[model samples]
Target: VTPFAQVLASLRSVRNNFTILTQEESYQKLAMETLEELDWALDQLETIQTYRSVSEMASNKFKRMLNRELTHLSEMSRCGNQVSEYISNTFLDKFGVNTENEDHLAKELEDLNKWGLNIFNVAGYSHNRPLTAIMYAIFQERDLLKTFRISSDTFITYMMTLEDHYHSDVAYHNSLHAADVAQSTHVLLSTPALDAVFTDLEILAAIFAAAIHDVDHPGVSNQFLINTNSELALMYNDESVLENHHLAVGFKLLQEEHADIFMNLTKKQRQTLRKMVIDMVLATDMSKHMSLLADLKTMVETKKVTSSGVLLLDNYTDRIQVLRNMVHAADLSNPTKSLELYRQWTDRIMEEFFQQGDKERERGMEISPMADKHTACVEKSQVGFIDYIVHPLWETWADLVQPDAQDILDTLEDNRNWYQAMIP
Candidate 1:
C-alpha cells in the first residue's frame, strides 16, 4: 500500500511542476498554495488506493482518477486567480483610492462594481475574473473614473437605449463589441511604456473613447458607409463615416442631465478631452491602419524616457502615437485575449465582415478577402488573415509594450496555431 505521505509527495511534485511553468512570482506563490491543497486531497486518496480486494482496488483507481481531475480543476482556478491579481495589481492600482478614508473609497468601489456588472451583462459576455480585472483597471484610473462620476446614470441609460439601436436583421454591432473594444483599449493602455507618458486627461479620453467609440455603428465599416452613399457619409463629407458618427453620437449621449460627468471640468479641459477622444476614435478606421502603424513605429524608434524613467511624450508626434496605437490596439486585440473570449470575438467579427461582403456581392462589387461567403473558408481564411495582417500589426504593437505584451502575443500565436491546425 502506498503511504499517505507518498501520495501527498506525488501531488506536491505535480504542483511544483506547475509552479515552475508560471513566469510571474506572485503566481508561483498561488500555485504553491494550490498544490498544497491538492496534496491534502491526494493523502485522502491514498487510503482508498490501498484497498486489498480486486473490486476495491478498481474502485480505488476510479477514486484516484477523480482526485487527479480535481487537481486539474484546482490548477485552473490557480491560473485564473493569478491572472486576476496581475491585472488588478498592475492596472487597477492607479485608481488612487484613499483606503484610509473607508466611506469614500467604499462608495467609489460600489459605483464601480455596479457599473462593471451592468456593462458586462449588456455586452452579453461572461462576467469572468479577467473581464472584471480589465474593467477594474479602467475604473481605477483617476481620469477614466471621472467620466463614470460625470456621466452618472446618463451613461447607463444611454447604453441601455443604444442596446437595440445598432442591430441588423442578423447580428448587430451592439454593446458587446463596444465592451470588447473598451476592454481591449484598457489592456493596451496598461502597457508600462505608456505609463506617465499620457496625462490623466488623455487616459480618461482613451477610456471614454473606447466606451463611446462604436455608438450606433450601423453594422458596417467606413468603406461601406461611403460606398452606399449613406447619410453619415454625406454628413462627414465622404470621410470616415462610421468613426465620425460614432464619436458624435457618443458625445451627444453624454449631454443628458444625469450623464454630465464632464460638467465639472473647465471648458479648456473639456475641449482637450473631447479633441483627444475624437482623434483616437477616428484612428480606429481600418483605412487609417497604415498611417497609424507608421506613426507608432516612428515614435517607438525615437522613444524617449523621463528623468524618473517613465516614457516621455513632450512632442506631439509621441503623444498622438500613444492615442493612435491605443485605438488600433483596441481594434485588432481579439487575438490577444483568452481563448474562450477570443473565439467569441472571431464569431462576431467574421459575421460582421461576411455580412459586408454579402452586401457588396449583391451590389456587384468586388468582395474583400475573408468577406465572401461562397468562396471563403472560415478556418483557413482566419489563419491567413492572422498571418498576413493581424500578426504583423500586433507584433509591432507588442514590441512597443515589450514584456507586458509578451504573454498577449503568445496567446495570439497559440490561437493562430489552433486555427492553422484546424484548417486541414
Candidate 2:
C-alpha cells in the first residue's frame, strides 16, 4: 500500500479496536468523519496531480483536517490495554525509521520512541514498535536467523504468519500479549546469570517459546474452554488444554515450508529444539505456576555459578526449568513493570474478566472471581492479585535475575498502595 493509504488503513484498525467503547453513535461518527476526510484529502491530492502542487496546496488545510480527525477519533473512546501490548515490527521497515527523521510523526514520537517503553502508546502512530522491538531484541539484535541458519525473509514470513493467527477481537489474549511476553522474555534474558546460563540454542528456544507461547489463543481461559467443551478443550482432553492448543497450533504454522525457519536443523537438533520449546510453552499454563515458581526458588537457592559469576546449566532439566520460569515470569511481568504499564494491563485484564463474568451469567455458570463487574473492585482486585500472586512471583524473580528489577517490584508495591488508597 502507498504510505498514506497504509496510515488510513491503520486508523481504521484503531477505530475498529476502539469500537467497543462507542455507544453506537460515537464510532459511527468516528468512522464517517475519518473516512470522509481522508477520502476527501486523497481525492484532492490526486486531482492536483503534481508533487509541487501538493506542497503548495492547503497550507495545513489537509494536515489540520487529518490531525483533527485523528484526534477526535482517538478521543472518542479507547481500547484500554490488552494483555499489555500487541506490537507490530512491520511499522519500522514499512514506514522506514531512521532514529533521525523522514516524517513529522517520527520527530513528535521520537522522545517517547525507545525500546522498553509503552508500546501501546507508540501503537497509536502505527510504527509497529511491539513486534519490531521483539524482532530486534530477539532476532536482529542477536542475529537469530543467522544463528539458526534461517534467512531474514524466512523469519519475517514466519513471524507474520504467527502474527496472523492472533485474534484481535479478544479483550485480553492476543498478539499484544504474545509480543509483550516475548519482549519481556528478552528483558529477563538480559540478566547476567540468566544470559550466561543458556547456550545459543537454548536461548533461541526460549525466545521462540515466548514468541509462540500463546499463538492462536481463543481469548477465553481454560475454565471457559472446558465449561463450553470447546473443540480446543476436547482436542487436548482438558489437560493443559489451552497451552496444548497454543503449542500445537503454533507449530502447525511452521509446517509451512516457506515459514519454517527451523528447516536447517538436523533430526536430533530439531528434536532438542522442539523439546525445549514444548516444555517452556507448557509451563505458561497457570496450572504449572506453583511448581514452576517452586523450582525457580529452589534453583535460586542452589544455583551453580562459577567464581566468575557465570550461571551454569550442565543439565537440560535444570536449563529447561529455568527457561520455563523465565517465560512464566515474563508472561506475568506486566504487573511488575512501569506503573503506566501496570495500570494499562489492569484496565485490560479487568475488562476481559468482567466480560467473562457477563458470558458466565449468560451461560448459567457461576461468575468468576473478579469477573463480576458489579461486585468487582478493579483497583482492589489488582492490589489483591499483586499482594497474593504477582509480588511474590516478581520478588522471587528479582532475586533470581536482576536485583535492580527490585525497582519494578517497588513500583508494584507503590501501584498497589495507590489502588489501596483509591478504595472507596
Candidate 3:
C-alpha cells in the first residue's frame, strides 16, 4: 500500500480498536476523546484527497493538523511505555570500565566522511567492531567527549560494551547496521545547510541513539514477535516492541559506572539528552514513519529560513521533529546509498527475512510475503519499496534540507532503476 493507503488502513484499525475498547466503563471517556480525534483525522484525509491540487495553503494546514493529531494519538496510546521510569536510579551500580582506543583503525577510518564509507570494509578492518571505531571518530569530530566531560576510557568502554550487546549473528540488524546508522545520522546532521544548527547535547543524543537503536535485535519484525507471543512483545505490551527494548537495554547499560558516558553532565542535561534519545529511537519504528514524514511535509511547507538558508526551528516541537526524521531517514537510508552498498544491505535484510520465514514455516504460521525466500522476488520488492516508501520520504527530506540531499535523491533514483531493470 501507498503510505496514504497504509495510514488510512492503520487509522481505521485504530478507530475500530478504540470503538471496542470504549465499551469498557473505565476507558469510556478516554476512548470517546480518541474517537473524536480519529474522526477529525479521517475527515482531514478526505479533505486532503479532494483539495490536494486545488488549494495548496489549505492542504498544507490540513497536513499540519493531521500530523499534530497523529502525534497526540500515538502519545496517548503509548502512556505505558515510560522509558525514564525503566532506566531510573534504581538500576545504578558503582563500578569501573576498562577503556580501549582506536589507533589501530587509523588506516581504515579515513573514509568516515564519505557517503559511501563501506561499513562492511570497516567491519572487516576493525574485525567486526565497527560501532566503536565509527562512534569514537564521530565523538572526536563533534568534540562530544570533551564537551560532555566523558573520559576516553568511559566513552570507549561504553561504546564497546554497547557494540558487544548487538547480536553479531544477525545478518542485517547487527552492530554493523548500528554503526552505519550512526554514521548516516552524523552525515545528515553535517549537511552544509544544517551545519551547527543543532546543539552539542542534541548531537550527542542523535549519534548515541543511532548507535544503540537496534542493539540486541532479534532479526525479526515487530509483527513476527507479536504474532509468536515473544518475550519482548510481552515486555513492551506489543507497542513498538523492538524500539522499546532497544531504548531500555541501551539506557540500562549506562547504569554501570564505567559505562556512564553522561556522568559529567548536569542532571537536567542528562534528562534532556535521555528524553531526546528515547524520542528519536522511538521514531525509528517503521509504524511511525508516515506520521513523521507528514510532519516533515508540513514543516517544509511552513518553514522559516534564516538569512543563510538554514532552517529556522524556533521551538522544541519543531526542533525535535526534524531530529526524529533525521534518525528515521538514516535508519532507512540503504536505498539512498551507493548501489553497491544498497545491494549489500538488500541481501543482508533478505537473509534475515528468509530466516524469519523459516521459523514461521517450522511453526505452522503463515510467512510474511517479503520473508518467503522461495517465492519472493528480491528485485521487484526493492523497486516497490523505493517507489512507495523510500522515495517519498527522501524527497520531502531533501526539500527540508534543500540542495544538501539532492545528490542523495539522485543516487536513490539511479539505484531504483538498476533494481527495476533486474525485475524480469
Candidate 4:
C-alpha cells in the first residue's frame, strides 16, 4: 500500500475522510472490526501502524511503512523465483528417472514377493526411504490424487517429509517397515475377493495409513515405553502410545502449508478420512489384536456377501471395520510370507523384543513376554505365536478371500509346521 496519495482511516467515532462518524452500536462494531484488522496487518507486516489523520497518512511514517512492506514483498518474491529457477535447473534436469528404472520399480513392486518385495530396496529417482516415491506411484496408479482432488506435488512432498520423519535406525519400525506394510496392504487389496470392495478414497487412506503407521518409532514397544515412564507414554496416557504418536506426528506434518495434501477434500470427506485413518492405525496396537480379530471372525461367519462373491458392506461401520481388520492383517503379515522371509522378520522382531527385555532387566521390571533372552525359545515361541496369533487371522482372511489367499495360508501352515517340528 502506498503512503496515502489518498486514504481513509477510522478512529474513536470519526472517519479519516472527515465524514460524520457515529457512536452508535452498529458504528462501534464496524470501527472496532476495522481497527482490529489494521492491528493484525501491522502485526503481520511488523511495520508501523497506519496514520489516523489526513496529515499523518500523507507523512513520512506511512511512507516509511509502505517502503518497508514493499521491500519485504520484493525479497519474498525473489526467494521463490530463485527456488523456481533451481527446480528447473537442478531438480528438473537431474531428477529424470530412467525409462527402465521406473519399469523395474513397477516390476519389483508388482511382484509382491515373499518379503513383500523389499520396497526399501526401491531406488528413489525420488526420495530416500523411497516411501514417498512408492506412495506417489500407487496413488497415481489408482488415480487417487485426482479422485481426492489432491495436488501431485503436494501429496508427494507430504509423503517425502513423512518418510523423513521415520527413525531410520530402527530395524523393524522404520521407513522400510512402513513401506512394507503399505505394500502388504496393496497385496491384500489385490485379492480378487476384496479388490472391488474398497472405494478409491478408502484405498487411498488404507495404503497411506499403512505407510505412516509407525512414523518415528523409537524401536521399542508401547509397553516398554510405558514401563520406562517415557515422555511419549506419559503424553498418551499409556493407551496406544506408539499408535497415537504416529497419528499426531503425521497430522502435524500435514498441517504445514506445503504438505497439506488433503486440504482440497470436503469437510465431510476429511472427517471421514481422519476417523478411518485413526481407527486403522490404532487397530494395529497389539492390545486391540484379539478384539479386532473377534470382530473379523464374526464378519466371516455372519456377514453376507454379494452374489458375485465379495463383501457386502451396508454402511461406514461395516466397511471401515473390514478395513480396520485388513490393516491389522497386513501389519502382522510377516509370518504369512514365505518361510525365508518369515524367518527374517522373526529375527528382527525378536531382536527388538530382546532389547526391550534387556531394558526391563536393567530397570528391575519383569521381562516382557517373548522377550526374556535367557529363557527364550525361538522355535517354540514361533510355534505358539503362529498357532495362536498368526493362524487365526490369516485363516479368517484366507476364508474371506477364499482361493485368492489360499497360497498365503499354505505358506503359513508350511512355516508353522516347520516350527512345530523344530520343537526338539
Candidate 5:
C-alpha cells in the first residue's frame, strides 16, 4: 500500500478497536482502560504522520498542524499511562527518592513511550515535518527531553514518588488534567505572534508550568482552600491554595536527581525560569481570574501590531500578558480544541467538578453549578462556562496573538455552536 493508504488503514483499524473497547464494558470502565488505548492509537498515528514527507509549503503547514495534534495526543497518553503505572507500581512504595529504585523508574518511562507510540499508530496520521520539531516545541527547553536519557527505571521511579506526594481524589484534577493543560500550553505557545516575542526560555517555562500546574491539586478551588482553612491555605497565607501548592510541589520534584530536567540551566536562567513558571501557574487560581482578565484586556487595548504584520511585544506589559494569558488559556483550553477532544475534556472536568460538589453536599456546604447530578443541560452549562469563564480569557489571548489565534478562536466559536445546538 502507498503510505497514504497505509495511514488511512491504520486509522480505521484503530478507530474500530477503540469502538469495540469502549463498548466492551460500562462507560467508567471504558474511560479508565479503553479510552487510554484509543488515545495511544491516536498518538501513534500522529507520530507516523510526523515521519511522513510532503512538498515544501504543504509539508510545513501539515507538520505544524500534525505537531499540534500529535503533541497533544502524546502528552495525554503519556500522562494517562503514568497515572496507571503510579496506581499499580508503587501504591505502597515510600514517597521518597531511592537510589535502588532504578528498575521501577525504567518501567514507567518505557510504559510512557510505549503508550505515546501506540497512540501515534492508532491515530494513523502523518506529519509533514520531522517529529523532533514537535518534540522540541513540547519540551520547550532543548535539553528537557534528556529526562528520558536516564534509565527509564529511575525516571519512572521518581514520577511514582512525585505522584505519591500529590495524588488527588478529584478525577478531573488528576494526571489527566496535567496532560490537558500541557497540550493546551503547547498550542497556545505555538501562536506565530508568540513565536517572535518569546525566547526559548519563556517557552520552556510555560510548558513546564503546564505539566506541573496542578500537582497534587485537591480537586477544590482556591475558595475552598481558604474557607476550609486547609493547611495549604495557611502555608500560602490564604492565597491561591491549589495554585501555590502546585508550584511548590512541582519545584520540589525538580530537586530529584532523576527528574532534574532543568539542571543544565545557569542559576540566573533557573531563577528567571522559576519566576515565570510560578507566575503562570499561580495565575490559574480562580481567585485571580478577574485580575488576570482585567490585565489581559488592558494589554489588548494597548496592543501593538508589528510592521511585519505580527503581534508586537516590545513592551514588558505586552510580553508578560502573553505568558500570563497563555497559562490561563491552557488551563481553560478545552472549548477551543477539536470537537472530539473538547468533548473528552468536558467529560473529565465535569467528572472532577461533580465529585467536588458531592463532597460538599456530604459536608452540608453550598454546591456549585453542575456539581451535583449529571444533567442533559451539560451543553448549556458548558456554554456558560465558556462565555462567562473561558471565552473572555481566550478573546484577550486572541488579541495578543492576533491572526495566529484566529483559527483557534474560530474553532472555539464553532464548538460553542455545537454545544448550543445540543441544548433543548
Candidate 6:
C-alpha cells in the first residue's frame, strides 16, 4: 500500500474512537474540521499530480507546491497518532491531587490578579518554590483543569519538574522570574474588554509558556553563549540560543508519565498548544524585540473591534500576535511594576549581567552590554532601558488594549522618572 493510503486508513480507524471519547459539540466540531482540512489537502494534491503529467512547463512549480502540501499533511498526521493511543487507554478519574493542602495557598496567592503582587514575598512564603505554587493557584483559579480535563497531579508534577529545572543560583531568569511572568500574563488576560477574545486553550498556552519560559537559564545573555562557544549556542546554531534551550528543556520534561499535564488533550489541541508556546517563548529573545514591536504597532493601527468595543482578532495571526506581545510584555515587565518591586528586579538582573561580565573578563573577551559593574551606571541604564525599550513596548500595548494597560503604563512612567532622578 502507498504511505499516503496507509495514513488515511490509520486516521479513519480512529474516527469511531474519537466520537466516543467525548460528546462535546465543540470538540466534535474541531475534530471534523481537521478531518475536512486533511481531505481538502489530499484532493488538491491528487489534482495537481494528475495535471503534472499533462504539461512539462508546470512540473517544477507543481513540484514545489506538492512538497509544501506534503509537509503540511505530514505535520497533521503527526498530531493525530496520539489520538489513536488515547483510544486504547482507560480513562483515569483520580489522576490528580486533592486541594485540601492548597488551603494556605489561597491567602498566599490572594494578590495574584493584581499587578502589584510581590514575587519576593511569594518566594519567602513558598520557601523558594514560587513558580510551582503560583502555577498551581493560577490553574485552579482559571478552572483550566476542568476546561482542559487535566489531572491536578499531572499539573503538580509538571510544575514541580519545571521549577526544578530553573537554576536557583542564577540571580535573575530563575523560577521566580517565570512565576512573576505567569502572574502578570494572568492579569493581562483578565482585562475586562479582552475577556472573551481568547479560547481556554490559548489561555493555558500563555500561562504554561510563561511558567517554563526561562527554565534553566545560565545567568548570561545569548551573545555570551555564542562568544564562549557554549554547547547550547552551537546546538541552536546561535539563534535565540537561550530561548531555544528553555523551550527544549520545558517540553522535554513533559515526557515523564505523571508530568504530562496536557495528557488528555486531542492531538490537534496539543498541536495548537505546542505551536503557541513555541511562538511566545521564542519571541522572548531580545533580538526579536524590534520586529515584535513593529508587528504590534501595525496591529494597533489597523486594529478591529467588536460592537461592544473589545478588540476583534479574527484570525490566528492576529490572535497570536496579541498573545506574543502579552508574554513579551510580561517578560520585560520588571520596570512596569511598583518602585519597590521594580528595583528588586533591576538589581537582580544587573547582578546576573555583571556576573557574565566577570566571566568575559576571565576569558579575555570584550564585556557585553550592561555587564561592566565597575563602570556601568546602573541608574542611567535603567533610565535608558525605560526610554528606549520597555516604555515603547508597554505604551504600544496600552494603545492596543486602551484603558486596560493604562495603569501599567503610568507605573512605568513613574518608575522611569524615579530612576532618572537617582542617576548621580
- Runs in model 1 deviating more than 4 A are 1-137, 140-151, 158-172, 306-309, 357-369
lDDT (10s digit) by residue, model 2, range 312-344: 778888888888988998888877677777778
Candidate No. with top lDDT? 3
- What residue pairs are clashing in model 4? none
Q: Write the per-residue lDDT of candidate 1 for residues 3-67, one digit (tens) a residue.
A: 44455677778767866775778877887787777767766675645336335545566556655
TM-scores of the models, in the order given: 0.63, 0.71, 0.77, 0.72, 0.62, 0.77
The parts of candidate 2 lying over 4 Å away from their true place are 1-115, 125-129, 402-404
Q: What are the lDDT scores of the predictions, listed in order?
A: 0.66, 0.73, 0.86, 0.76, 0.66, 0.85
Q: State the TM-score for model 1.
A: 0.63
For model 6, how many clashes?
Answer: 1
Ranking of candidates on lDDT, top first: 3, 6, 4, 2, 1, 5
Misplaced by over 4 Å in model 6 are 1-105
Ranking of all predicted structures according to TM-score, beginning with the best and ending with the worst: 3, 6, 4, 2, 1, 5
lDDT of 6 by residue, 18-106 (tens): 55653779877887887777667656755655343435435544555655555555557665445433432333111444464345555
Better of 2 and 3 by TM-score: 3
Report the C-alpha displacement of residue 217, candidate 1, in angstroms: 1.2
Candidates 3 and 5, the one with greater TM-score: 3
lDDT, candidate 2, at 239? 89
Per-candidate clash tally: 3, 6, 0, 0, 26, 1
Residue 113 C-alpha lDDT in model 5? 20
Span of 10 residues, lowest total lDDT, candidate 3: 85-94
**What stretches of model 4 exceed 4 Å from their correct place?**
1-95, 99-106, 112-116, 123-130, 361-366, 372-375
